[PDB]
Ligand binder design. Structure first.
Ligand SMILES: Nc1nc2c(ncn2[C@@H]2O[C@H](COP(=O)(O)OP(=O)(O)NP(=O)(O)O)[C@@H](O)[C@H]2O)c(=O)[nH]1
Ligand SMILES: Nc1nc2c(ncn2[C@@H]2O[C@H](COP(=O)(O)OP(=O)(O)NP(=O)(O)O)[C@@H](O)[C@H]2O)c(=O)[nH]1
Ligand SMILES: [Mg+2]
Ligand SMILES: [Mg+2]
Ligand SMILES: [Mg+2]
Ligand SMILES: [Mg+2]
Lengths: 482, 482
């Protein structure tokens, strides 16, 4: 039911508490982080973990234990990574952690660490064809994904803290460090246009880009980045000092490692010749959980199975017999109007998911429920949806039975967004479908003419007619009940 | 578990679906409305209900049945009011409704109708000392409330549709109708400074006031109105035509009845000499439900029992063992800082409820969870809370571990709001209490010096110290762990 995953990283030791709400439904119940930096001064002593950072990891792990127990978790899986697997005292740390708190750390290998990164990306992102990039403190993992399946894995022994402690602490030439980077980046035997940015270093870089570009959506999971347009600026971050990084929105804990990790990313992108990187909020923690939940399904969700959409329903509407019919009437109502709007048939995906969650906001309050639904969509419908998908679905629910202004920030957040006339049509269909599904109606059938839309049904539909004037129309048309 | 209440009004026939989540927890699961206006042309025929409006009520009620069944409701209570109880064909309508759908309408009397209005107001409003005013289509109910107890009841046979059909349809002098109003308003044997505005007519008038005053809170339930400051404008509404009412934000369907009902309100307020009216979103529908839920408790919630707060927890956090300790540490932390802030001891109510719901937003997403909590507070914490109470609690949770800007709209929505220095202190205490309650700590004790705040505990509190720099302080002070 409730599962905890501890990621003992080189720089960041994370924790994540997952809750299983269905066969495939799950949502992140809690998360935290700690900059213990277990690998502080170890890359000069041949991976010998000093006593100062190790005792910090003991106290952090000892309190991560209380958190996992505080949330009544029935499973706890601990994993270590580069800074621990490449340690001569590796077995010494796995013993003393049980001495204090009683946690059995399972050391992961570089090939197996890159596995989880691909498991999380091949199922929780709107694209299943890319190359993961987990730039961590000690190691940089990559993995090719092809239509959900992971092909090849590689684990470069290069990281943000590693490159920092031996190159950037000595103020060596920036191209001197870029040589050691290329020493391991050139052995990447795969190339792809897409890339999946994983790790706190890449997410910190994505926050800087969202800041200057004045991005309206406040979520980083799924943020598309033009690799060719932004590669120039990414290389510059290495040359900026502490103050200049502060103005760009870099956190305090991510100052000594951001510019070292920014160099590593600029080399990988140009090597892979990527043209589109996608920020990922999921990483090793989510990969460990998905491998268990999908052990009987080959580490892949079945077709048309989205974990965010499923988990969002189980939380706020476990009885969707009402919202299920609202969707089924949108599909019929759409093709029954295709001459007038001539809308691409790909937008049914957005209109269908909208009809399922348009009434989700009622769990908070029946007044402004569609406003509450759009808030839930824009902030929770994360896994498997791009920001454009969420923006469309958000606008469809928010402006139900209303007209969309011309200066909507979320409507103009991208150049690939549909036109307002297209959005008004989808919102109109959903508005009309909600009116026809309000009562316990049954087996309706529609038909169009030039401007007349006639609805055939053996039901009275008295209420559906009374609120018909309170309906925004995309173009002049007539709605008649026969 | 799920209960439906149908209110067959003179003008508006409403429906409300309630869900019982606890012994005293309940939230409005669904609501709707229909302008059937069963009393159209009956006040000229001595209450004879015409055939045109009655057959509309048959189709509306027949579909209200499907809604109640669609939501798996185990109880359905139907009540009629003035336009039906004063009808010669009253028994004829109660029979033909069973003929079509099978609903047993229970006709309520004027004294019993005013009862439910007081039951809803004496438990779901931030003041329990007032006089209810249910200005409906046919009758205007009033009821004195004293510290939760209802003293006297009266049922004036005056309404918005009644006064319209025989006075305002003839364009008689506005003071001619004001005489028939005074004929029944003078028999009000009670007076009080407070008033509780009930009904769609009074809520429509409250929406007009919130619009011109540019009210930032978008909820009408609990909107305080200065009776002496706004009585002048209320009388004017009768003199404005259709167009001018459109600009003021009046809903089309409330156009023929708003100006007739606006006259009725101006007479009652001046008679009662009220100085503060409080808009009420709850009415007859909520009174019927509360009389059942509180049948064994004398139609009153026990002390410190809020139905909105209880129902809000059961929905989004039925396991509050974590949030219950976050509150208990706020109370101790407050008095352990009283010399430095010298804050009124009445604000514990806001700080205590904040500590219980500050982590409520995690059910939506762990990222920006405090932002999600504030959204839930400002939009759902309705029953028993004034807009000032919600605004304070909303700001405490939203700006946790952050500083509050000087131009916050919700912070400057009233002249009685506390100062930002007071709000920063409360938000600081909550931020510190959340850090001390993160782990499964136990039995802490604090103490203050001039600027030193020393926290005594037998726990390590390693994580609580790491995130101490990320803490906004109201004034320069020192936090030490001993
Ligand atoms: N793994 C992951 N991290 C994220 C994502 N979005 C933001 N973060 C990171 O999560 C950290 C915390 O953000 P937030 O969760 O909003 O902190 P909070 O301390 O938890 N505040 P609150 O309790 O109000 O939710 C930030 O340092 C940010 O880098 C995401 O989608 N995935
Ligand atoms: N009884 C009551 N009515 C209210 C309250 N707040 C708004 N209303 C009324 O409820 C009616 C509908 O508002 P809304 O519920 O937002 O309509 P909706 O059609 O239900 N839209 P949505 O599905 O987005 O929630 C309006 O006509 C308004 O007058 C309230 O607190 N109590
Ligand atoms: Mg890692
Ligand atoms: Mg509603
Ligand atoms: Mg009434
Ligand atoms: Mg969080």
């Amino acid at each position: 039911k409730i599962t905890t995953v501890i990621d003992i990283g080189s720089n960041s030791v994370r924790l994540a508490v997952f809750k299983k709400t269905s066969q495939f439904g799950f949502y992140l119940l809690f998360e935290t982080k700690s900059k213990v930096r277990i690998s502080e001064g170890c890359y000069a002593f041949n991976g010998i973990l000093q006593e100062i950072p190790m005792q910090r990891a003991v106290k952090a792990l000892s309190e991560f234990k209380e958190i996992a127990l505080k949330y009544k978790s029935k499973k706890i899986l601990c994993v270590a990574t580069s800074a621990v697997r490449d340690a001569p005292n590796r077995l010494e740390f796995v013993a003393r952690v049980k001495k204090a708190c009683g946690l059995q750390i399972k050391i992961i290998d570089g090939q197996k660490e890159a596995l989880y990164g691909g498991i999380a990306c091949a199922n929780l992102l709107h694209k299943n064809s890319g190359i993961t990039i987990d730039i961590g403190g000690g190691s940089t993992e990559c993995a090719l994904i092809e239509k959900g399946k992971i092909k090849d894995l590689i684990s470069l022994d290069v990281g943000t803290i590693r490159i920092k402690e031996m190159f950037l602490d000595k103020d060596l030439d920036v191209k001197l460090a870029k040589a050691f980077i290329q020493k391991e980046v050139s052995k990447l035997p795969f190339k792809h246009k897409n890339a999946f940015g994983v790790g706190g270093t890449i997410r910190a870089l994505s926050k800087v880009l969202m800041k200057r570009f004045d991005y309206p959506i406040d979520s980083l999971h799924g943020y598309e980045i033009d690799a060719h347009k932004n590669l120039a600026f990414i290389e510059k971050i290495v040359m900026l000092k502490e103050d200049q990084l502060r103005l760009l929105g870099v956190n305090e804990e991510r100052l000594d490692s951001i510019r070292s990790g920014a160099l590593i990313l600029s080399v990988v992108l140009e090597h892979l010749k990527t043209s589109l990187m996608i920020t990922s909020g999921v990483g090793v923690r989510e990969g460990v959980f998905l491998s268990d939940l999908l052990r009987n399904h080959y580490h892949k969700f079945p077709p048309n199975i989205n974990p965010s959409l499923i988990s969002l329903k189980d939380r706020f509407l476990p009885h969707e017999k009402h919202s299920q019919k609202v969707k089924k009437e949108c599909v019929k109502l759409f093709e029954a109007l295709s001459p007038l709007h001539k809308i691409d048939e790909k937008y049914l995906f957005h209109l269908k998911i909208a009809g399922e969650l348009a009434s989700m906001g009622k769990i908070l309050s029946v007044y402004l429920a569609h406003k509450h639904s759009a808030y839930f969509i824009l902030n929770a419908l994360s896994y498997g949806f791009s920001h454009q998908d969420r923006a469309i679905i958000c606008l469809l629910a928010q402006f139900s039975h209303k007209k969309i202004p011309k200066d909507n920030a979320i409507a103009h957040m991208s150049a690939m967004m549909p036109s307002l006339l297209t959005l008004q049509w989808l919102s109109f269909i959903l508005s009309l479908a909600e009116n026809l599904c309000l009562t316990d109606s049954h087996h309706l059938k529609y038909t169009l003419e030039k401007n007349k839309l006639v609805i055939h049904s053996n039901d009275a539909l008295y209420l559906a007619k009374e609120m018909l004037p309170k309906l925004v129309k995309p173009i002049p048309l007539t709605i008649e009940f026969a």
